[PDB]
Structure formats: C-alpha cells, structure tokens
Amino acid sequence: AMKTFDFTGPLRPGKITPRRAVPSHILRPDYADRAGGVSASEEKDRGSKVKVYNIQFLHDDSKKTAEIQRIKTVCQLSREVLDIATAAAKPGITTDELDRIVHEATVERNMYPSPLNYYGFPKSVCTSVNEVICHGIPDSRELEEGDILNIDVSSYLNGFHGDLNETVFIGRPDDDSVRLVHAAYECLCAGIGVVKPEALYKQVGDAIEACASQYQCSVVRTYTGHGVGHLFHTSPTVCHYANNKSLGMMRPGHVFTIEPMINLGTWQDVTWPDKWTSTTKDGRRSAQFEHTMVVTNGGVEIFTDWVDGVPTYQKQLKEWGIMLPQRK
Amino acid sequence: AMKTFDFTGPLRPGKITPRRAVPSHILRPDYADRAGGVSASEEKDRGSKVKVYNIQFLHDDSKAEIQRIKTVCQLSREVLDIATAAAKPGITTDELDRIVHEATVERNMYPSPLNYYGFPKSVCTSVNEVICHGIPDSRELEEGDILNIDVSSYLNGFHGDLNETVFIGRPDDDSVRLVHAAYECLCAGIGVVKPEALYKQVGDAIEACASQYQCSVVRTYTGHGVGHLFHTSPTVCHYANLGMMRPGHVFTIEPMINLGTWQDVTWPDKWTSTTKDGRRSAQFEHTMVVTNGGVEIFTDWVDGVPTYQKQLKEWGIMLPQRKESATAV
Ligand SMILES: [Zn+2]
Numbered sequence: 001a002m003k004t005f006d007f008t009g010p011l012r013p014g015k016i017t018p019r020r021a022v023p024s025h026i027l028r029p030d031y032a033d034r035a036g037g038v039s040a041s042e043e044k045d046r047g048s049k050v051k052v053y054n055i056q057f058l059h060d061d062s063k064k065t066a067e068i069q070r071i072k073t074v075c076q077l078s079r080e081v082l083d084i085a086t087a088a089a090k091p092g093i094t095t096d097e098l099d100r101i102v103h104e105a106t107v108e109r110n111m112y113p114s115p116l117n118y119y120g121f122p123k124s125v126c127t128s129v130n131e132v133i134c135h136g137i138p139d140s141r142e143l144e145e146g147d148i149l150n151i152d153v154s155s156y157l158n159g160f161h162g163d164l165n166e167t168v169f170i171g172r173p174d175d176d177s178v179r180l181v182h183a184a185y186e187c188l189c190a191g192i193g194v195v196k197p198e199a200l201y202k203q204v205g206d207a208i209e210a211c212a213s214q215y216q217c218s219v220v221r222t223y224t225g226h227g228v229g230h231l232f233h234t235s236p237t238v239c240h241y242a243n244n245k246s247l248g249m250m251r252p253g254h255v256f257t258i259e260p261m262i263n264l265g266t267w268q269d270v271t272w273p274d275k276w277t278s279t280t281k282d283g284r285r286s287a288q289f290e291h292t293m294v295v296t297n298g299g300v301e302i303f304t305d306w307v308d309g310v311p312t313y314q315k316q317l318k319e320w321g322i323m324l325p326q327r328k
Numbered sequence: 329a330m331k332t333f334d335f336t337g338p339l340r341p342g343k344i345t346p347r348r349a350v351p352s353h354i355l356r357p358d359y360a361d362r363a364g365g366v367s368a369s370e371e372k373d374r375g376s377k378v379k380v381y382n383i384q385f386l387h388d389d390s391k392a393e394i395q396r397i398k399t400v401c402q403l404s405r406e407v408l409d410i411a412t413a414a415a416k417p418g419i420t421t422d423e424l425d426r427i428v429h430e431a432t433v434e435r436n437m438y439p440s441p442l443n444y445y446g447f448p449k450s451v452c453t454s455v456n457e458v459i460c461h462g463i464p465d466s467r468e469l470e471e472g473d474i475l476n477i478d479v480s481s482y483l484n485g486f487h488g489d490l491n492e493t494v495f496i497g498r499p500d501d502d503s504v505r506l507v508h509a510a511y512e513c514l515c516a517g518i519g520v521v522k523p524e525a526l527y528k529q530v531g532d533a534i535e536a537c538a539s540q541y542q543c544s545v546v547r548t549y550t551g552h553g554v555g556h557l558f559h560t561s562p563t564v565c566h567y568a569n570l571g572m573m574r575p576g577h578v579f580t581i582e583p584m585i586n587l588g589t590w591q592d593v594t595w596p597d598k599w600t601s602t603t604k605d606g607r608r609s610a611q612f613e614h615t616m617v618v619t620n621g622g623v624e625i626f627t628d629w630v631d632g633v634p635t636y637q638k639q640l641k642e643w644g645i646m647l648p649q650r651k652e653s654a655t656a657v
C-alpha cells in the first residue's frame with residue numbers, strides 16, 4: 001500500500017545525495033556492508049543482561065587496549081569530530097555539507113562513522129533541525145538564521161563505538177529557543193546527577209522530567225539512551241521520562257548514554273516518509289544533548305565532555321551576551 | 329537515539345533470512361540494485377498529473393502499454409495463486425517468500441517489493457493484526473491465523489499489483505466477518521469507478537460498507553497509481569472525505585479494514601504496520617483501469633471467486649450478512 005503523511009511543522013526535507021565512501025583500510029562494523037544494514041551481533045545480543053566492563057584500568061590511560069579505554073579513545077576522537085562540525089554550522093550551510101565535514105574528519109582519524117548504513121540509515125551523521133527530535137537525514141536544506149541544530153556523531157574504532165550529540169544555535173536565537181536548548185542541557189545534567197553505583201535506572205527519567213517541567217518543556221518517550229560499546233545500541237535502555245518501567249540497578253562498569261530529547265510542546269513524535277526523521281507531533285521545536293559515560297567505583301565518568309567542560313551553545317550565548325533562562 | 333516500541337497484539341517478528349538474488353537475465357526496475365532502494369523515476373514524477381493510458385487496444389489481446397499492464401497483472405495472479413496454495417499451518421512466511429520469488433523468476437519477471445526503498449523481501453506477508461507490509465520471517469503460520477499475500481511484479485517496464493487475505497486452518501467467527509468485510513469493501517470501492525467520478529467517492533463507499541460489518545478503515549495507507557511506476561498518482565483514500573477519474577487511469581483500490589480502532593503503528597523493522605489496539609486487520613486489492621464506460625480489473629481470480637470463499641464453502645461456513653441512519657416509532 002502507499003503511505004501518506006502530513007507534516008506537522010514548517011520544516012520540509014531537502015534532497016538527499018548518495019552516502020559517502022569509507023576508505024578501504026578502515027575497519028567496518030558488522031552492518032556496514034550488508035544490504036539493509038542489519039547488525040547480526042545486535043540481533044543476537046538483544047534482551048541479554050547489561051555487560052559489566054572491567055574498570056581496573058579506567059584511570060590508567062596508558063592501557064590503550066582495555067575495553068573501557070578503547071571506548072574512551074573513540075569517544076574523545078568523536079568529540080574532536082563534533083567540535084569541527086559545530087564550528088562549521090552557520091546560516092547558509094546545508095546539513096549535507098555538515099555530513100561531508102563529519103564524514104571526512106572521521107575517516108581522517110581512521111574511524112568508521114557509525115550511523116552510515118546502520119539499519120540502512122543513509123548518511124554518516126544525524127542532523128536534526130528545529131521540530132526534528134532525532135535522526136534527521138543530512139540534506140540540501142540551507143540552515144537559516146534563527147534555527148537550532150543538533151549534530152549526533154558516533155564513530156567506531158578498534159571494535160568500539162563512541163556516541164555524543166549537542167544542540168547549537170544557527171545565528172542569534174529567539175527566547176523560546178534559548179529556553180529550550182538550555183532546558184535540554186540542564187536535563188542531561190539532571191540525568192547524569194542520578195548516576196552512581198546502586199542508583200536505579202528508572203530514577204534517571206524522574207530527574208530529567210522534573211528538570212524539563214521547570215522550563216515548561218516535555219520529555220520525548222519513544223526514544224531513549226542506550227548501552228554502547230562493542231555494539232552501537234545495547235542494554236541498558238535508559239528512559240528519559242518520569243514513572244517509567246525501567247528495571248535494574250546501576251553497577252560499576254556499566255557503560256551507556258543519557259540523551260534526553262526535550263520539546264517546547266507535547267512529548268509526542270511522528271516519523272517522516274524517509275522512515276528516520278522524527279518530529280514533534282505539534283510541530284514545536286525539540287532539542288537534545290548526549291554523553292557516553294561509565295559508572296565508576298564512586299560515581300560517573302563522562303567520556304565525551306567538551307574540552308573545557310563548557311557546552312558550545314553556552315559559549316555562543318556568552319559571546320552574544322544573551323542570558324540563560326531561569327527555572328520556575 | 330534508541331527507539332522503543334510496545335507490541336499491540338500477540339504477533340512478534342521472527343528471524344529474517346538473507347536476501348534472495350534474481351537471475352541475471354531478468355530486467356530490473358531502477359531501485360533494484362541501488363543501496364537504500366530509492367527510485368529516481370518515482371522521485372522525478374512526484375506531484376505530476378495522473379497519466380492517461382491509451383485504451384484503444386484494451387480488448388485487443390494481440391495488440392502496447394495497457395496490454396503490458398494486463399499481462400503482468402495476469403501473471404501476478406498466477407504467482408499469488410501458487411502462493412496461496414502453499415499457505416498452510418506450519419509453513420513459514422519465508423517459505424512463501426521463496427515460493428513467490430521462485431514463481432516470479434520462473435516467469436521472467438522482477439518481484440516489485442524486493443529492495444523497494446529497502447524492503448528486504450520479494451512479497452509482503454501480513455498476518456492477523458498486521459495491516460500491511462509484513463516481512464516474511466521465521467515464524468510458522470498457525471491454525472486460526474489469517475494471511476494477506478500482496479504480490480507485485482515488474483515485467484517489460486510495467487508493474488502489476490494485487491493482494492488477498494486467506495484463512496490458515498479453520499477460521500473463527502471474527503476473522504470470518506473481517507476477511508469478508510475487507511472483500512466487500514473492495515467491491516464497494518470498485519463500484520464507484522467510471523469516467524467523470526471523483527476519486528474521493530471511493531472512500532465514501534468503502535467506509536459506508538465497512539460500518540455494516542462493525543469495522544473501521546485504515547487512514548494512513550491508500551491505493552495508488554501503478555504502471556511505469558510502482559506507486560504514483562492518484563492517491564486513493566479508503567475512508568470518507570482531489571481529482572476526477574478519466575478513461576485510461578490505472579490505479580489500485582486496496583482497503584485495509586480493522587476489527588478494532590482505525591489507528592496504526594509501525595514495528596521497529598520500519599515496515600510492518602499493525603493496528604494500534606492489536607485487533608485483527610484484513611485487505612484485498614485489485615489493479616484496474618477506468619474504461620470508456622466504467623471499470624475493468626486486471627487482477628481477478630481465475631473464476632472470479634475469491635480464494636477465501638472457496639475455502640469457506642469447502643469447510644461449510646456461512647457468510648455473515650450485513651447489518652443496518654434513520655428510525656421511526
Ligand atoms: Zn498497491
């Protein structure tokens with residue numbers, strides 16, 4: 001049957017061009033070369049218990065071959081890639097041009113861009129504009145003054161993935177977009193604040209939703225954080241909303257992302273005919289930030305921090321002298 | 329991010345076998361070998377006016393575009409018949425995919441669904457609460473199930489498109505009224521097709537007929553133009569309330585009818601659509617042309633008896649009658 005779809009906001013898809021080639025010498029994850037992009041290892045793993053990584057050498061960065069250190073390495077390299085991409089994002093630049101830059105910076109580092117052909121995703125990075133919640137496909141649309149853009153980078157290197165994302169302003173933002181982007185970052189911080197040994201995974205969402213409500217925003221329910229490591233998506237499932245069904249306790253050596261998607265209107269999402277792009281059902285803007293982290297002996301260590309710990313959108317607001325919105 | 333999904337009924341995806349190859353000599357549509365299965369012809373066409381085909385040679389089985397369409401439609405009926413014959417309890421939908429693929433290649437045609445926008449199989453096998461676009465999998469068909477097989481074939485530059493729902497083992501009362509309502513809805517829709525009729529009147533008839541069996545109509549998925557392209561204009565909505573029919577318009581009417589709510593959700597595989605409430609869904613489809621005088625379907629059964637009816641008569645099961653806007657006291 002033929003599918004019909006009505007758009008819920010002003011955004012429309014641009015043209016999508018072919019996916020970029022990865023140099024021969026770069027090692028591929030198992031879904032890279034398969035038509036349809038199914039990951040056999042993920043299909044095999046799904047449902048199984050959360051992995052406990054060995055963190056014996058978490059704090060000896062000379063131990064480069066340790067699983068947890070390979071995760072740290074690919075995460076730090078992915079931060080280099082994401083900072084290149086955000087620096088290039090400006091009014092008049094297409095998201096496909098950002099895909100060129102992320103793809104080339106990733107392969108320059110001898111890494112494979114994880115999104116590329118992942119279950120058939122057709123580009124090397126997700127670029128999500130305005131009402132797009134997540135999984136926007138890089139296309140020929142020029143970014144416009146006043147837009148917000150999330151770039152979600154993930155890379156695969158020596159058998160391990162790293163994953164991170166952030167939202168930045170494209171030109172000077174309006175008040176609602178400032179409130180939304182800051183709310184999304186505060187929500188990431190609220191979630192991470194829960195992380196420590198013996199915390200319950202379900203508490204992450206209680207904390208995020210509490211924070212979101214203080215900025216009059218809602219929390220996306222369909223999409224979640226995830227374990228990441230040898231696999232791109234694995235357990236645990238990390239729900240971002242309150243009173244959720246998440247089972248399980250955090251333990252030292254658990255590796256996962258927290259990546260809340262926060263909306264100015266209702267929490268509900270819809271999917272574009274491309275089968276990937278998710279937007280808000282009411283067409284209002286959505287923003288997201290993401291870190292990969294490990295539960296440590298005493299707390300939590302993020303591997304995907306900004307170089308000075310200051311998020312790029314805050315640097316933009318400080319440059320413009322625009323104030324951070326206050327909680328209610 | 330990671331996507332979560334709550335299954336709405338009892339069905340679950342099975343394992344999905346590797347992708348089948350098509351013999352070297354068979355002609356392929358543009359999307360066949362392309363990563364992601366995009367079709368450039370469909371992309372270039374989107375928005376353009378409905379194509380009027382030349383019907384001068386419509387009944388000249390010796391003389392052509394309309395006849396190429398008729399041919400692939402008739403051969404596609406054969407394939408669907410071979411496929412419905414094989415559909416028994418214990419048989420897997422992947423086994424059926426094998427049979428359709430082989431039967432289609434056997435006739436030197438390309439199976440249209442294969443790699444269509446990345447669809448992994450050569451045929452859609454939709455079971456029970458699945459509205460459409462079911463992917464053939466490891467699951468064995470079970471006693472009491474209903475199965476829709478949706479066949480589309482590509483041959484000499486044209487697609488033909490048809491589907492029907494059959495029973496797997498002996499059907500309960502509810503599946504009986506559903507499958508029959510779905511078929512009756514197709515007839516109701518076909519019964520509006522003639523020159524100068526409005527495309528919108530199709531859903532008027534379908535929904536009216538659907539009500540009479542205590543059934544709702546799927547709003548998200550529609551009939552479509554078919555021919556050079558797999559999906560093209562017109563868009564043919566199946567529910568109540570743009571364009572007018574004209575001789576030489578070739579399209580499908582393919583009402584998807586549900587026992588519960590009209591609403592649909594989509595599985596993580598990105599294709600399989602089930603009802604939101606998990607209740608059962610059923611569908612029938614013909615390809616047709618608007619003739620000089622009315623309509624003509626190219627995908628009819630060999631004798632015009634729907635396979636599900638033959639199954640019912642052979643099992644001796646009564647056809648549920650319709651039911652009853654106005655009252656007087
Ligand atoms: Zn169709």
Ligand SMILES: [Zn+2]
Nearest residue numbers: 152163164165
């Ligand atoms: Zn990510």
Ligand SMILES: [Zn+2]
Nearest residue numbers: 163257259329
């Ligand atoms: Zn992630």
Ligand SMILES: [Zn+2]
Nearest residue numbers: 478489490491
């Ligand atoms: Zn069909």
